[PDB]
Amino acid sequence: SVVRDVAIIGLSGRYPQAKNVDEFWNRLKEGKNCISEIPKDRWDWQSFFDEEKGKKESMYTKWGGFIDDMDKFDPLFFQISPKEAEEMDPQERLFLQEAYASIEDAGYTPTTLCESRKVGVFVGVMNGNYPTGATYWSIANRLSYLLNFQGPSVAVDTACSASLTAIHFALESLYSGTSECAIAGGVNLIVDPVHYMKLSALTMLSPSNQCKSFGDQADGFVDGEGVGAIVLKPLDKAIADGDHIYGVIKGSMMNAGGKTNGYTVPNPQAQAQLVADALQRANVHARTVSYLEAHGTGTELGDPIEVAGLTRAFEKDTQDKQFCALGSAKSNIGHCESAAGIAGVTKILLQLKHAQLVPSLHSRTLNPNIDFTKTPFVVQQELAEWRRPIVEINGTTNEYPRIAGISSFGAGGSNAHVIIEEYIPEEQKQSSLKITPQNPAIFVLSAKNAERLYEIVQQLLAFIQEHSLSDEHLADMAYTLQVGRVAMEERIAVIAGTMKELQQKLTAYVKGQEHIADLYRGQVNRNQEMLDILTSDDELEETIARWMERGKYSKLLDLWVKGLSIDWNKLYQEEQPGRISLPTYPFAKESYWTHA
Amino acid sequence: KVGVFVGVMNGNYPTGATYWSIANRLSYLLNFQGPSVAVDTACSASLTAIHFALESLYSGT
Numbered sequence: 001s002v003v004r005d006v007a008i009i010g011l012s013g014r015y016p017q018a019k020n021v022d023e024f025w026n027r028l029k030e031g032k033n034c035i036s037e038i039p040k041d042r043w044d045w046q047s048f049f050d051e052e053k054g055k056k057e058s059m060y061t062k063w064g065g066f067i068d069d070m071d072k073f074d075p076l077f078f079q080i081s082p083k084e085a086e087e088m089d090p091q092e093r094l095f096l097q098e099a100y101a102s103i104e105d106a107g108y109t110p111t112t113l114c115e116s117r118k119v120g121v122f123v124g125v126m127n128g129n130y131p132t133g134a135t136y137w138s139i140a141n142r143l144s145y146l147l148n149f150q151g152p153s154v155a156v157d158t159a160c161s162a163s164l165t166a167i168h169f170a171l172e173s174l175y176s177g178t179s180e181c182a183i184a185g186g187v188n189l190i191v192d193p194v195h196y197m198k199l200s201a202l203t204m205l206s207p208s209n210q211c212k213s214f215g216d217q218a219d220g221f222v223d224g225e226g227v228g229a230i231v232l233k234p235l236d237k238a239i240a241d242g243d244h245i246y247g248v249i250k251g252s253m254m255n256a257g258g259k260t261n262g263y264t265v266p267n268p269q270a271q272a273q274l275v276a277d278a279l280q281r282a283n284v285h286a287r288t289v290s291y292l293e294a295h296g297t298g299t300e301l302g303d304p305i306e307v308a309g310l311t312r313a314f315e316k317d318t319q320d321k322q323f324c325a326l327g328s329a330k331s332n333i334g335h336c337e338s339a340a341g342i343a344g345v346t347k348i349l350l351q352l353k354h355a356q357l358v359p360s361l362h363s364r365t366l367n368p369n370i371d372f373t374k375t376p377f378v379v380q381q382e383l384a385e386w387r388r389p390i391v392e393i394n395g396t397t398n399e400y401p402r403i404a405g406i407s408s409f410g411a412g413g414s415n416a417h418v419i420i421e422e423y424i425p426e427e428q429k430q431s432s433l434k435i436t437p438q439n440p441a442i443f444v445l446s447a448k449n450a451e452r453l454y455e456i457v458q459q460l461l462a463f464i465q466e467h468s469l470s471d472e473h474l475a476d477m478a479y480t481l482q483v484g485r486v487a488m489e490e491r492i493a494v495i496a497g498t499m500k501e502l503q504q505k506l507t508a509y510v511k512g513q514e515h516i517a518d519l520y521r522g523q524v525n526r527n528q529e530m531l532d533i534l535t536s537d538d539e540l541e542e543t544i545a546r547w548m549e550r551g552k553y554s555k556l557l558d559l560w561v562k563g564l565s566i567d568w569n570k571l572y573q574e575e576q577p578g579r580i581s582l583p584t585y586p587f588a589k590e591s592y593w594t595h596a
Numbered sequence: 597k598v599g600v601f602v603g604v605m606n607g608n609y610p611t612g613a614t615y616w617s618i619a620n621r622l623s624y625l626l627n628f629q630g631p632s633v634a635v636d637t638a639c640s641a642s643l644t645a646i647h648f649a650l651e652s653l654y655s656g657t
Contacts, residue, residue: 194612
């Protein structure tokens with residue numbers, strides 16, 4: 001059907017030295033170069049290292065963007081056996097965990113995300129080096145099975161553009177209505193030295209730890225790892241349901257360069273057509289774009305071609321010069337193949353959340369072959385406020401939203417581009433759910449076992465501290481914890497009328513205090529029998545309804561913590577609080593590996 | 597604007613799974629500049645590829 005606006009309602013990711021998107025923000029804002037030495041637990045690089053570029057069965061770098069705890073997993077959470085976990089590619093494991101976390105971040109459970117179960121799964125992947133083989137379809141299908149998704153389920157491989165192709169397909173699927181909700185993302189892990197030997201034989205990699213995006217002396221990219229997932233939802237429905245929205249994808253395109261002077265040589269004309277077509281489909285004039293996250297792999301050939309293409313595409317709409325900032329996240333985390341597009345999307349969404357532009361590293365001296373004074377763009381060098389541009393298109397002047405474009409190009413010539421606009425809410429702050437000591441909030445927490453629940457409490461205290469959450473967040477926090485977390489076997493619940501009170505009681509719990517006022521502990525495992533026989537009848541769900549109205553909070557929580565199912569939505573008779581991001585489940589970190 | 601959609605699910609050759617190149621080599625050699633993608637949906641993979649092609653034709657890309 002027709003192009004329409006698509007909301008991003010959920011986000012999770014793991015990047016070098018960034019186990020969550022908060023760390024990613026800290027790395028971006030500070031201009032951190034996240035490249036490190038090949039960990040000994042991957043292989044010993046000295047055995048294979050040779051300065052001779054292009055040599056066979058060798059490599060000329062010691063560097064990569066490696067994530068921590070690559071081999072860890074919580075198989076019991078998913079009722080997967082340890083042997084099966086050993087046999088599962090860790091790429092599948094990590095995408096599964098990030099998608100689950102992204103669902104928690106949105107504030108939904110697997111059941112309520114989509115009642116029809118028509119949730120699509122689209123995943124980009126291009127490397128399959130685990131010893132048990134490439135099994136890309138299973139990265140999607142494992143998710144669809146475990147989470148009861150009955151929409152499309154597909155693994156895509158378009159090389160370096162794979163995750164942006166996947167996003168494009170997801171937008172198509174939402175437009176045609178075969179999915180009402182969708183998971184989109186990509187994954188790439190470096191699990192075997194042959195990964196580096198192949199890239200080294202074609203001399204595509206830099207020897208150094210610097211991806212010099214648009215910088216002088218460009219000599220290839222630094223290889224990287226990444227895993228990310230986003231939840232996509234129609235904008236109108238996202239507004240109606242009160243979800244929190246990182247941004248609105250207005251449109252995208254993917255294409256290929258066709259025949260150029262040599263295989264893997266990029267074609268600037270096709271890139272220009274790509275970007276022009278994305279802008280036309282989005283109905284976005286190029287002059288309103290104020291940041292461009294480039295592919296920016298740091299090769300001497302590709303960067304000038306890219307800038308020529310961008311200049312040609314923008315010059316179709318405007319002759320204005322140096323109005324749009326340009327940068328690349330690869331300067332921080334390196335080039336991560338199938339996850340490069342999702343990493344760039346994440347950076348754009350974080351910039352929108354913080355309304356900030358971060359440094360693009362290693363471009364203090366610009367490519368001497370690129371005359372930026374002849375272009376629409378200024379390469380972003382320092383942390384700066386991201387300004388809404390004021391623009392006189394058509395001799396009419398208006399303020400436009402912060403809008404960014406992102407391009408992603410594959411080695412085989414497959415290109416994609418996506419247009420992302422800030423979401424600007426309507427100013428409705430009735431605040432009729434004001435949480436006070438007279439109208440306290442119900443905070444519920446649960447986990448598979450006591451260790452995980454304890455870690456959940458620690459992470460909540462830390463998150464409240466980190467983001468300076470206070471009384472005005474209690475309503476949204478409690479609502480999100482009520483309706484946006486699966487109620488697991490080990491449960492606690494706290495009544496609090498102020499943030500300080502919550503911090504006090506939770507710290508006392510963390511501190512080992514056996515008896516805490518208005519804090520209840522218990523397990524579902526114990527009272528399974530009586531639960532089964534009483535909840536069948538609505539008669540008792542009505543009794544709960546009356547307890548809630550009357551405010552018998554202590555009673556409901558004493559029963560809830562033993563396993564009594566409570567429809568927390570009935571707690572909000574008039575209106576609804578908003579969903580907010582909160583920390584996600586701290587999966588157990590146990591190592592599993594096979595033998596080749 | 598010729599699209600290429602190919603279903604594949606096994607990558608056991610000694611130099612590795614390089615599924616993207618099965619499509620991109622074709623698009624390069626024949627000067628095709630439409631979408632070029634390797635899809636893996638296991639057994640149904642080629643019919644998934646057909647489904648994608650039908651969509652792509654429907655939207656006019």
